[PDB]
Paper text:
The 26S proteasome holoenzyme consists of a 19S regulatory particle (RP; a.k.a. proteasome activator 700), which is responsible for recognizing the ubiquitin signal and unfolding the target protein, and a 20S core particle (CP), which hydrolyzes the unfolded polypeptide into short peptides of varying lengths. Three of the seven β subunits in each of the two β-rings that align this proteolytic chamber (β1, β2, and β5) are proteolytically active, and between them hydrolyze most substrate peptide bonds to generate a variety of short peptide products. We show that 20S proteasomes can degrade the ubiquitin tag along with the conjugated substrate.
In order to better understand how a ubiquitin conjugate enters the proteolytic chamber of the 20S complex, we performed cryo-EM single-particle analysis on purified human 20S proteasomes before and after incubation with MonoUb-Cyclin B1-NT. Although free 20S complexes are often found in a closed-gate latent state, some proteins with substantial disorderedness are effective in activating their own degradation by gating the 20S42.
Residue numbers in the entry:
A (entry chain E): 9 to 241
B (entry chain F): 4 to 236
C (entry chain D): 2 to 233
D (entry chain G): 6 to 244
E (entry chain A): 4 to 242
F (entry chain N): 1 to 212
G (entry chain C): 2 to 248
H (entry chain B): 3 to 231
Amino acid sequence: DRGVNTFSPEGRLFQVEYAIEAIKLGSTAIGIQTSEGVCLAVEKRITSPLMEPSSIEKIVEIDAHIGCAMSGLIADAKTLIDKARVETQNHWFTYNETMTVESVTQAVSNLALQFGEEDADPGAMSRPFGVALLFGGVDEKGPQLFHMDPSGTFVQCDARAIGSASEGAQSSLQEVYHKSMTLKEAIKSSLIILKQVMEEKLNATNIELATVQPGQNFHMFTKEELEEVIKDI
Amino acid sequence: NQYDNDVTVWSPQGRIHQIEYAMEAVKQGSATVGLKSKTHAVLVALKRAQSELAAHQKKILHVDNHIGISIAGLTADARLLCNFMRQECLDSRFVFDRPLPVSRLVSLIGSKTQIPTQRYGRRPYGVGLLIAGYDDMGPHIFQTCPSANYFDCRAMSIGARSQSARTYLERHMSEFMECNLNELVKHGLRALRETLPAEQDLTTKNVSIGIVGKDLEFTIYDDDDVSPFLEGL
Amino acid sequence: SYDRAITVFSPDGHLFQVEYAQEAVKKGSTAVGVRGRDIVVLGVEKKSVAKLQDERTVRKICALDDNVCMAFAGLTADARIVINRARVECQSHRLTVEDPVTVEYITRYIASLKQRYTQSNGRRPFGISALIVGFDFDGTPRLYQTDPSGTYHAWKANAIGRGAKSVREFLEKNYTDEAIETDDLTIKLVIKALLEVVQSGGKNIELAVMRRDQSLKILNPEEIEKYVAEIE
Amino acid sequence: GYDLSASTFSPDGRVFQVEYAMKAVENSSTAIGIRCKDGVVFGVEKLVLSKLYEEGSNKRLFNVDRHVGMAVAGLLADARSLADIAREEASNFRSNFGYNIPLKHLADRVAMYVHAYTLYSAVRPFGCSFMLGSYSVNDGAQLYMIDPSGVSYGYWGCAIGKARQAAKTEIEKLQMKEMTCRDIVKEVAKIIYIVHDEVKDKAFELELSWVGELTNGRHEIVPKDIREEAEKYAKESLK
Amino acid sequence: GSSAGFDRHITIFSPEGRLYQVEYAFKAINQGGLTSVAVRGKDCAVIVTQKKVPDKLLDSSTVTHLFKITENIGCVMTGMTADSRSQVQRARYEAANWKYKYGYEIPVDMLCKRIADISQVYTQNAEMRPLGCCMILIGIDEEQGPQVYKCDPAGYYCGFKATAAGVKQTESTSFLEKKVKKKFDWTFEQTVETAITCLSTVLSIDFKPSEIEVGVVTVENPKFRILTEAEIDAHLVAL
Amino acid sequence: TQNPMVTGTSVLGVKFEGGVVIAADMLGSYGSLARFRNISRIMRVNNSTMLGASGDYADFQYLKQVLGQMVIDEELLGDGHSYSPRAIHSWLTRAMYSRRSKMNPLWNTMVIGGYADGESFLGYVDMLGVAYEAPSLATGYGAYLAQPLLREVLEKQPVLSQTEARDLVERCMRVLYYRDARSYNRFQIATVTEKGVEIEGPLSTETNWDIA
Amino acid sequence: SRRYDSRTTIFSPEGRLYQVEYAMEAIGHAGTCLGILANDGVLLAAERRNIHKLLDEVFFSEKIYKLNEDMACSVAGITSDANVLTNELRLIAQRYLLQYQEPIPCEQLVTALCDIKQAYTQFGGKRPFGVSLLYIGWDKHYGFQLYQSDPSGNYGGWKATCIGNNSAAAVSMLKQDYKEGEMTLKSALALAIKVLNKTMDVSKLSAEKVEIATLTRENGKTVIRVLKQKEVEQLIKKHEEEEAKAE
Amino acid sequence: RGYSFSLTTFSPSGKLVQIEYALAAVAGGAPSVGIKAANGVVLATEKKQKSILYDERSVHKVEPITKHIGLVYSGMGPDYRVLVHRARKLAQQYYLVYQEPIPTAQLVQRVASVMQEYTQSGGVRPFGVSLLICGWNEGRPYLFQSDPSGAYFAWKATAMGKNYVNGKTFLEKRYNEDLELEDAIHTAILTLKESFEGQMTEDNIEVGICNEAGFRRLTPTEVKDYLAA
């Protein structure tokens, strides 16, 4: 009845207005920006017991110093994380330097809102992305945690929760967060809020967590490392 | 009813709803203020809080050394239009080895913003801009709208509840030219303060102030650098 | 060129063309497969044999490479485009990499292809879902499932097509370390699951087993009847 | 649903998207021009919305070439595009044929660019009427006006804006054929104020320009000294 | 008449296959409110149309429906004036490519067929509407002599002994068809009066010298000439 | 331009206090032949800028319509910003460099004089895009036969007057008439000052003395 | 323009393609055509649609359109939409012989067109071909073959099949009288005439309403021969007399 | 830019409506009757002008393609011309490649291929014109009929235009395969007399013939001689 480029009577641009509602159908992802690093925790939402949990990656490697959490449709974010990995290598190739987290999220969010059915290019995107990405990592300015909406608006966040339970999960982050908290307390503070927002039981299988320290690189906790943090919760 | 779905469809009143809905998005944005004296031009912007733990935004972007802008509207469409402004200013210094006049840069925006409006399947740019720059003719406040037309202003405020600021600016608009650099910024602060609810106030974190001048290039002031300017407010 | 958006967002964040593409999957023939130890087994349920068919070209179990094969459920035409373009990638991978394709590689290529036609202009999503089995260079068995939306997941056992909701609940309860032990017991698990979704009875099915030591050889109609008798 | 596209005729053989386009001109402030013996004089009623706008903002008088002026009435966005197109039309002529473009040819090249968008559904007609004028030794003074439909006629004087008919009654009795340019400047300012409405649109700024023999065929905005004398003479006759 | 689906907008087949949309391009010709009369004699061909200046501020020399396609071929247009100038520029460009490619001046025979082929492309494609005007071309062929042809929005260029167009097309055709009875309708240089009386009878105007514009082609003068109002007054005073 | 056809000869220049003056003789050259002697190789760009060129005269007319028309385009909108003599020198250097990259160069060699903001500008643009600014400039064989005379006076007295620089140009143009075969008797002298560019008519070198 | 677009390539709420499902009904009213896989050869029996007496004969056949030296087809559907497909099949078969210097296998040529018939059911916004057409031929590998291709872009192997009008009642008859592996050529000519009777509303077959073409191997060379009117009339008289002795 | 989506789509009951409606425009056209005799083919159509001011020598409803081929139409005037000017181009592209006069059965397949391309490719409507194509090749006469759908049929004798159903049954009775070219001209004229409603004359019809000497349309003088009988 109408095209992909249209403005609402309030100017909401329905296709992105509806793409945000698709995020509320996705799994919950939480992250926290501390001074000693950032943590990224996400619910896997296992559909069936026969589903292999190792094949669900909601947290992927952008660069060695950067990592990202995903939500909503898993497929739509695969093309963005692929352009992010190419963008970070194109920067390291030309400038011989690690690409800052600010320029990564800004380059990926440029792909948002760019779509059209008229003379866009030989290939083109028919619809915006229904995904919400939490970028995180350590840059020359220190640990940073960013968010990317389907509207291409990227915002710096100390702690932010996304997904279906994002409402009511953000209210818990603002209560327990303070600028002086460490990374070990951030990993523990993430699982307690996940325990509230997750429908099924919380164990090492159905949760996916990874952190970025300034000294170390991006690393995801194995099955044996997650069992230690859960026992502390 | 059926005239608002396309930008190329005139209404029986000789009016385009799709362009007016785009001008509704810039009024649903965040309030930004700018004004000029006989010496300096200043941009003052509220950095909007999407949540309590999130670093608000960056609403003032660098275009060239002598030019800077403020954003009210879709943010990804702003930097999409700002990347054209940055490339247009680098084009002049590359070819002509001179700073591109602020009056001519805005003429290039009106020509680019119109093309989506007249063609089928494309949407108007939903971001307004307050362009502050210092040319050989002095400071320039030139405003851009979703409608391709532009306005040369002495003082202007855009975004949500900007009419309360335009009421303040219209009252003191006579004394702006005689103001010094420090006193000139304080007028934009009081104008932008009227755009806030009774329960909110101007702080160092939510306020960014751009300044351009004759012997001073365009520089943005962060939360730490806006403290001397907020000392008199 | 025809440029228009067929798949667009809807109220409450839904994609009609993608959701209706998954409804065409549930209208296709049932394909079931499991992942054993040294063995992986695929099987399908033919709707009507009629004994006028040439059983060779109507097979729903294809071979993407020597170590990788797939069986689908959905519109038959939409599948043949995916198999043909996946076989080109398997050969283009041996050209550049000089190594056989991993099962996860070809699954990501197919999943990224089913995605591309969801967000492309003037192109409808595929109406098929695929079950890919194979063996990596280390010898580990793999089972994956792709959807018209473009999402892929590994599985111990899975079912696609009509009646896959009941077969997936059947496989979930009966899959254990005992049934996946013997190579013959793994074959009997698929047949026991297929007989639940087949209303006609007997064996109208077609089953294919791919081991490691020596590539896939699809079982004849007489060989599948021997296991069907032992499960009676 | 015949009016939803410019490629669809009505049952009576009318194109509404072209007719709705010229209704946007009727919602725009009045701009007039007068062709006299010594040249062409332009004038515009320029409505400033907020007092914050700088004087000279939203300039309604464009120079498409050095000897040709332009005055627009309609959507200001579509007016600036056709100004750039008319500059390119006069640009490509001087490059190819090596001499200044005749305004008979310039008005036709622009009228066919405006008409080209009325035949298709992929584009919309322009919402701005505009006028052209110039002066030359051989060709003399010429004034043409292009409607949103793409039609161009010759005029001794014309009116485009909110009140189209009210200003035509003032120009018809003016007897411009025997009057020089400096006498028309005082008459244009008189017509702008009499057609203005002190009720609906309050604030306005008079924008005047001419082209003729006294500038040696060069279009320019009226100097402040002459413009101040014309505005005072016009308010005296307004009473 | 039965209409189904989108017959009413794009040009496609009605349930009776009438091109429901194309028939409205003929009704758009009457929107101009004018009538053109074309008649050919033995040694000459004549075109006469109504010249109406709605305002006294118009420039009479600029408003004309008679155009010169080439030196030996004239033209008269009836329809939307905006669509008129577009079709004339195509006829001038199509007649110039003929001389450049084929070496000799284009006949009136195949100048109308190429324009009729262009007007068809608008009817078959749904992305564009037909032109709302009809062209009437005259000239002197080498072998065939005088020729009068008219192409329409449907692309029908079929020849004429005499041609009528506009609002009075139906009335002026039946009246002049009774002059198909007298041999050659008295065919010689005074066939100008044949076209004048036909246009003057249906409109009941009794035109003045400046009320109509006339142009002619002859065997002695193959070049197309637009008659001056002083020369029109000579024929108007004789009837 | 792969090979030139009708070429010009050396164009002089010097900057004095208050403005800049250049001179170029009027002659065309095709294969060691004086063919078109009425051609004027000194161009007036706008009020504050003046230009002259040696080399192929056909490529110079192309830079007359491309560069001259760009001045109108800047004067149509009329916001008060005009092209400075060094902004035209920068645009024209970029145009000359973009032609050799496509291997379709412009054969000319150009000297851009101008006076703006109370500062005298004089600049050089070659076929290969080599550009700079010097107090005195001579192209073609003027670098050999003239610039040594320009540098000799400007080394002792860095700043000249309007009359002293004029005698310097007329004395260097006379030397070009003796020892340069492509030279010619009549020559244009154009001067830019605070009053704008003024291009004088033809002047004669006929005051030369031949003692044989 | 989005208002004028009919959305041919979209999905139905039930998971169906409208233009594909509607093209199937155009074939149900199309000309009846069948084929029978036998041991020594394959045949095509197609009921001729226009029997009009003022029609002449042009070239060699009506609905046949022999695609190659070793194989031929038969078309049922939109008459024009079949001509574009046959020209493409003659291009594909010759691009194979040009490239590999070998005759095209029948399984490869059917797959090649079904990719073209599908390309219009997915992208491009055009309408699909309304023609479902059969295939007969011989190759070096599997010998004589018979295929059927629907407008949906999917095909399949068949021992006996029928397309066009009354195809549902014709297949049901072929499910019985046909015997796998036991059918010879002359036995298949009798079975083809038997089906064309009950599946056509005409009281009998006059031999001008049917056209039969057989494909056999003679001296290592595939020959495609359309049975003439005298040869078809002998088959009709054989079945008409044998039907009387069976009752 | 043009529409890339097809305007002709399958109806619910399996039919292409834009082609079915294109046949209605043909059925309301002017009658055109071809007849294939033994030594030649004749094409006779009704050329009727709405008034006496129309010039009959201006446009010709019977136009040749090549020397040995000509064709006539029943339907819209303009949609015939863009079609016939392309048929003249396709025939000469054959002559450039093969240096041979194009066979009639070969030209009809290429023209019917063009009439189909506009029933499928998007943005264009089908033709409203049906053709009667005659030709002389390999010592045999040819008569073909191209429908707006793009399907061609070889006819011995047929008719189109207004009252084609009543006209087609009229040919079946009086047609004979042993007829010559001279006897076939009269039978084509008598069919145009079946539905006329007026007084037919030499300028009221247009007739042309194709024989071993090539295709040519009969001059208005030669047509009058055949109207006496």
